[PDB]
Amino acid sequence: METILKMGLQANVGSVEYDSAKILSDKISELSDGEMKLLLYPGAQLGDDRAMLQQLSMGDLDITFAEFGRMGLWIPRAEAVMLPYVVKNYAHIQRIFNSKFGQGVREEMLTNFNWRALDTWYNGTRQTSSNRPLNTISDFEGLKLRVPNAKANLAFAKYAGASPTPMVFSEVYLALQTNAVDGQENPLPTFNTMKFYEVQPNLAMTNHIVNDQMVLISEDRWQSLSKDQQATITEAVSVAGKRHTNFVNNQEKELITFFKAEGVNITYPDLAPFREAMLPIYKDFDKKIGKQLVEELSDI
Ligand SMILES: CC(=O)N[C@H]1[C@H]([C@H](O)[C@H](O)CO)O[C@](O)(C(=O)O)C[C@@H]1O
């Protein structure tokens, strides 16, 4: 081996994201005949996504994952893509990523922050688990709902009427287990592999945020690779992404049966009241960004 790359991710070994990172790594080695290798640093051992993104900018890490909307911390308009109920499905996030708006964000990521977006995959639609059944939006009143350190998720919790509790991902299981919080929200593969179902007796299909999953490489690293090495990474990303998105789609169907068998009570609230409750988020965001951006993205 001669060219050694490093990838970091928050998700643990055993997660869909890790499984796909291992595919990346295996395909990079296979297609390069062992000349290239990808080392893997899971479980947020390097920090959270925000920290790993900075490490990519500095060249201390080569590859990491990030949602398009997470770019909003550095490129404010991108946040709109993570506001609850804006993105309808994966095909919609693909239209956004490929649109002139998406291209403009991707160019800014490369120019300012040394991030080259190679693809974006489907990471699932977030759902809300809890220690009591949630059948209507009114049931969110008083719910101590853990959220990531992300304003969109915090706003979902706030406008649903819950009491948002930001917390890093690695601390969630213990907080649920001890009832320090009453619930969390994440896609179903995550709810499975993090074992949150072991400590959450209810799951509500709020369908509130569609998460993509960009594969970012340091632009400096990319430019230093040969054309052959670039082709290897492009093909590895294509192979891994096809498998990732398909696995998430399959799991979103198959996991319902599994969670029921494990004793989880699954509820399906009417979502029209949830969508209505989120409208002030869009008005505020449009006011801050200076245009009707949420509506323009929703119509892309
Ligand atoms: C790429 C990445 O690290 N994604 C992580 C996301 C994002 O940080 C968040 O959605 C904001 O974009 O948060 C989690 O879902 C969470 O803490 O519940 C864990 C997940 O691994």
Side-chain angles (χ1 to χ4, degrees):
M1 65 189 177
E2 287 296 329
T3 302
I4 297 98
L5 307 167
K6 298 182 179 158
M7 174 171 186
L9 62 158
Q10 289 204 89
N12 293 341
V13 175
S15 66
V16 61
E17 299 98 323
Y18 174 80
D19 288 344
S20 293
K22 187 178 172 301
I23 296 300
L24 286 177
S25 177
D26 289 344
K27 294 295 311 192
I28 286 168
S29 181
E30 184 214 335
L31 294 169
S32 73
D33 296 327
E35 188 275 331
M36 298 172 75
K37 300 290 191 177
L38 184 63
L39 296 165
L40 302 177
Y41 300 87
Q45 64 186 267
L46 305 178
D48 73 348
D49 54 347
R50 300 177 293 177
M52 295 181 275
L53 284 164
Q54 192 62 26
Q55 294 159 30
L56 250 70
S57 297
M58 301 299 290
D60 294 321
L61 190 63
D62 301 294
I63 298 173
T64 201
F65 289 132
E67 297 157 19
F68 186 100
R70 193 59 146 173
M71 295 292 102
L73 296 172
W74 299 270
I75 302 168
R77 65 192 183 276
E79 198 184 13
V81 179
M82 192 192 316
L83 301 178
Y85 304 105
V86 174
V87 170
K88 296 310 181 293
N89 56 40
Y90 179 58
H92 188 190
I93 209 145
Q94 291 178 298
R95 289 196 301 282
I96 292 165
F97 185 93
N98 294 323
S99 68
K100 287 175 183 199
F101 171 87
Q103 294 172 44
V105 170
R106 291 155 57 199
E107 281 155 26
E108 192 167 327
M109 268 167 69
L110 188 158
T111 296
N112 291 354
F113 309 114
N114 183 53
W115 301 327
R116 187 188 186 86
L118 297 175
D119 198 0
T120 194
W121 306 342
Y122 180 48
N123 220 51
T125 303
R126 305 182 79 99
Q127 313 296 348
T128 305
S129 68
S130 54
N131 63 9
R132 54 184 175 80
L134 308 173
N135 299 115
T136 61
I137 195 170
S138 64
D139 292 325
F140 278 66
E141 297 164 337
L143 191 76
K144 288 175 172 73
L145 180 55
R146 178 271 170 175
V147 292
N149 299 296
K151 287 178 177 182
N153 303 60
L154 176 70
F156 169 70
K158 169 173 162 178
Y159 284 94
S163 280
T165 311
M167 179 190 301
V168 298
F169 186 53
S170 62
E171 287 184 6
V172 175
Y173 183 96
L174 177 64
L176 301 171
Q177 191 194 33
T178 60
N179 294 299
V181 298
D182 297 320
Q184 62 81 58
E185 48 79 49
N186 257 299
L188 297 190
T190 303
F191 188 68
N192 180 39
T193 61
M194 291 292 277
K195 305 298 202 295
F196 294 158
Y197 65 88
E198 283 174 0
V199 290
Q200 292 283 266
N202 305 271
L203 178 65
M205 302 299 289
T206 50
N207 288 281
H208 52 277
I209 294 168
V210 171
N211 287 154
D212 71 321
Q213 200 81 172
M214 305 188 292
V215 180
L216 302 187
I217 190 165
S218 154
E219 170 67 359
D220 165 68
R221 170 66 77 168
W222 176 260
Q223 291 299 337
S224 77
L225 297 177
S226 69
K227 274 302 163 273
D228 289 351
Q229 288 172 325
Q230 289 177 353
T232 285
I233 289 169
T234 297
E235 179 63 8
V237 168
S238 176
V239 169
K242 187 189 166 165
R243 189 217 74 99
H244 186 97
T245 292
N246 185 55
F247 183 87
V248 173
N249 284 334
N250 282 344
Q251 291 291 282
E252 287 186 331
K253 296 179 204 179
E254 296 177 34
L255 283 170
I256 301 296
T257 305
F258 175 72
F259 296 141
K260 286 192 285 173
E262 291 296 316
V264 182
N265 176 49
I266 307 181
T267 65
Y268 298 82
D270 176 4
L271 299 185
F274 285 82
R275 298 202 188 83
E276 182 178 6
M278 305 301 139
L279 291 173
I281 298 171
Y282 313 150
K283 190 143 181 203
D284 293 3
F285 189 88
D286 284 352
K287 180 181 178 178
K288 179 195 79 69
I289 211 73
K291 56 175 338 178
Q292 297 294 105
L293 181 59
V294 170
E295 292 78 9
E296 286 171 357
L297 294 176
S298 175
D299 290 339
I300 271 178

